[PDB]
Design an enzyme around this catalytic site. Structure first.
Site, PDB file in Angstrom:
ATOM      1  CG  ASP A   1      -1.906   1.152   1.194  1.00 30.56           C
ATOM      2  OD1 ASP A   1      -1.836   1.978   0.260  1.00 30.56           O
ATOM      3  OD2 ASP A   1      -2.748   1.223   2.113  1.00 30.56           O
TER       4      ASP A   1
ATOM      5  CD  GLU B   1      -4.676   3.607  -1.786  1.00 27.34           C
ATOM      6  OE1 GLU B   1      -3.966   2.722  -1.271  1.00 27.34           O
ATOM      7  OE2 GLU B   1      -5.818   3.398  -2.240  1.00 27.34           O
TER       8      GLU B   1
ATOM      9  CG  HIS C   1      -5.869   2.598   3.202  1.00 27.76           C
ATOM     10  ND1 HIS C   1      -6.090   2.165   1.912  1.00 27.76           N
ATOM     11  CD2 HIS C   1      -7.089   2.800   3.748  1.00 27.76           C
ATOM     12  CE1 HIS C   1      -7.391   2.112   1.687  1.00 27.76           C
ATOM     13  NE2 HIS C   1      -8.019   2.490   2.786  1.00 27.76           N
TER      14      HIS C   1
ATOM     15  CE1 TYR D   1      -3.174  -1.995   6.783  1.00 28.45           C
ATOM     16  CE2 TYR D   1      -1.708  -1.401   4.991  1.00 28.45           C
ATOM     17  CZ  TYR D   1      -2.809  -2.081   5.458  1.00 28.45           C
ATOM     18  OH  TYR D   1      -3.549  -2.852   4.595  1.00 28.45           O
TER      19      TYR D   1
END
Lengths: 196, 39, 98
Positions: free
Chosen positions: C1, C32, C35, C39
């Protein structure tokens, strides 16, 4: 706000090294996009002809002058970065005529543009606030103020970020190269500032 | 300035404004955001 | 990613014509980015050494193979677009070789 929606990403992402600034410029672009959506929303309930407003203001010299002034020596940086990446150091010849080269040339042609960026969100858009804001105390168009307060907060955060970036890079040079840029591009900086 | 060496950031006036190709042709100059080509 | 966080914008924005797709690719990049933040959040409460996980997986051949496979003929498009914009139509010679 549309003249700087896609410009910062396509103009700065190929040069930024630390990803923690790439995330910030991505969020900046996204915030600018949300601004454009909010503008389209506020214009979609005022005049019954949204296709009639993008006729004069689209190419009105009154605004087109400053638009070209802010776009010319901002796309100059992008094209010079493309040249530097496609040719590298050392002089060359791009199909006939010789191609120039400069390491510091890829700094001023950028740094000065960044200065424009600052005044692109420090003064010119900052007066329009008050111009469209006096209709607040008098009870009318309160929705306009309600929707513009958040845009003002966003613009203020943009100003804080870009001013911090300029004061960290253009002033107090970490690398021992941009000090010459700060020394040379000083009087012309005030000249273009007073011109704007 | 220069003599329009190559592709620019955005044009000075309109080109088609409604029926340009998907990802080829003139750049973007104004975000109407209300009338698009694909719903 | 992370291999596709900044790639789509820097690879597609110079070519997209309609702005209604530029807005979408901007939102894609932002999503993104969110994201990546999520994470980093989920890894910040598992192993007490977040600086020890970016040692093998950073350059592990198991993942590096597919990383290079997806990056090579994806940056090829970017460099070819740069060439096309800096040279235009018709053959040329970029400093010597044609």
């Amino acid at each position: 706000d549309s003249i700087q929606g896609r410009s910062p990403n396509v103009a700065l992402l190929p040069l930024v090294s630390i990803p923690e600034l790439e995330t910030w410029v991505e969020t900046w672009s996204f915030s600018e996009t949300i601004h454009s959506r909010s503008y389209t929303h506020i214009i979609r309930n005022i005049v019954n002809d949204p296709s009639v407003v993008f006729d004069d203001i689209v190419e009105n010299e009154y605004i087109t002058a400053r638009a070209e002034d802010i776009a010319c020596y901002y796309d100059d940086l992008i094209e010079y970065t493309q040249y530097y990446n496609l040719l590298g150091e050392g002089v060359h010849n791009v199909g006939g005529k010789p191609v120039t080269v400069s390491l510091r040339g890829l700094k001023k042609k950028l740094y000065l543009c960044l200065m424009c960026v600052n005044v692109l969100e420090a003064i010119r858009f900052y007066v329009s606030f008050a111009c469209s804001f006096a209709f607040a105390e008098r009870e009318l168009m309160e929705g306009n103020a309600k929707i513009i307060k958040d845009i003002a907060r966003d613009e203020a955060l943009h100003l804080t970020g870009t001013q911090h970036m300029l004061n960290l890079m253009r002033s107090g040079v970490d690398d021992p190269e941009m000090a010459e840029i700060a020394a040379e591009l000083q009087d012309e900086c005030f000249q273009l500032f007073k011109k704007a | 300035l220069y003599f329009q060496m190559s592709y620019s950031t955005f044009p000075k006036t309109k080109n088609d404004a409604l029926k340009e190709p998907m990802f080829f042709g003139q750049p973007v100059n104004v975000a109407r955001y209300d009338q698009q080509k694909y719903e």
